[PDB]
Amino acid sequence: ERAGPVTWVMMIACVVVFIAMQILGDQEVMLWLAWPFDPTLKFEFARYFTHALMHFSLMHILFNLLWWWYLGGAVEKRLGSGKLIVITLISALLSGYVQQKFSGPWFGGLSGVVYALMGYVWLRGERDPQSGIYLQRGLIIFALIWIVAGWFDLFGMSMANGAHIAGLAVGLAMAFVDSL
Numbered sequence: 001e002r003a004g005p006v007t008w009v010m011m012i013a014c015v016v017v018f019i020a021m022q023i024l025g026d027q028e029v030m031l032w033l034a035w036p037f038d039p040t041l042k043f044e045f046a047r048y049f050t051h052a053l054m055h056f057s058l059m060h061i062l063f064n065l066l067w068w069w070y071l072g073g074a075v076e077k078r079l080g081s082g083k084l085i086v087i088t089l090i091s092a093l094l095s096g097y098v099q100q101k102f103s104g105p106w107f108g109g110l111s112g113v114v115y116a117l118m119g120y121v122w123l124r125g126e127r128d129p130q131s132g133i134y135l136q137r138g139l140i141i142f143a144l145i146w147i148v149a150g151w152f153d154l155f156g157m158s159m160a161n162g163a164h165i166a167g168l169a170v171g172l173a174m175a176f177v178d179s180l
């Protein structure tokens, strides 16, 4: 059993971008992938999504991809690639929007998407057990530790608490709808 296409391509894309950031520096890559930071860039639509591909430290990308691999992998396998695509697109857009609104356009990473996946997998398992998807009891503990790390700034994740809550809301909302 291996990670599906969406789970896999996202991981490889983030690694490729991370390498580009080490070679060229974070700033040069953000210039091209960050959320629109000037009116001249408002119609470069990829920017409303590409911010999610950038990570700023080894720990940032390491833990984001571990969670994406586990949660996204599970969602794709049991519920399909389409499900993972939508959760990802909606959470990246909303968390990015909230982040930009209160803290500016300079940010990046999959943490908002991870909050969405944590909320989705956990809630789906609590309300729709036989759906096959659930968050392992022990992993609920480490997910909480990861959440706390970012919430109290013990671990730099680029995005702010409000943006992460927005991502979580998307996951919970979709899980609620799916267990309907």
Ligand SMILES: CCCCCCCCCO[C@@H]1O[C@H](CO)[C@@H](O)[C@H](O)[C@H]1O
Pocket (backbone or CB within 6 Å): 001, 002, 003, 066, 067, 069, 070, 072, 073, 074, 077, 139, 142
């Ligand atoms: C604190 C970090 C969070 C815990 C990370 C646990 C990662 C477990 C990865 O498992 C892998 O998941 C793939 C996708 O579902 C399966 O295809 C594969 O067979 C399985 O080996």
Ligand SMILES: CCCCCCCCCO[C@@H]1O[C@H](CO)[C@@H](O)[C@H](O)[C@H]1O
Pocket (backbone or CB within 6 Å): 118, 119, 122, 137, 140, 143, 144
């Ligand atoms: C949204 C990602 C973070 C997960 C949040 C988990 C909620 C707090 C954990 O309390 C709950 O306690 C129950 C009683 O033991 C367990 O059965 C259940 O599994 C567990 O969830």
Ligand SMILES: CCCCCCCCCO[C@@H]1O[C@H](CO)[C@@H](O)[C@H](O)[C@H]1O
Pocket (backbone or CB within 6 Å): 136, 139
């Ligand atoms: C820096 C933190 C690293 C934590 C590493 C924890 C390893 C134990 C987690 O095991 C994983 O549990 C999943 C749920 O049961 C399985 O789906 C998966 O196959 C299995 O690999």
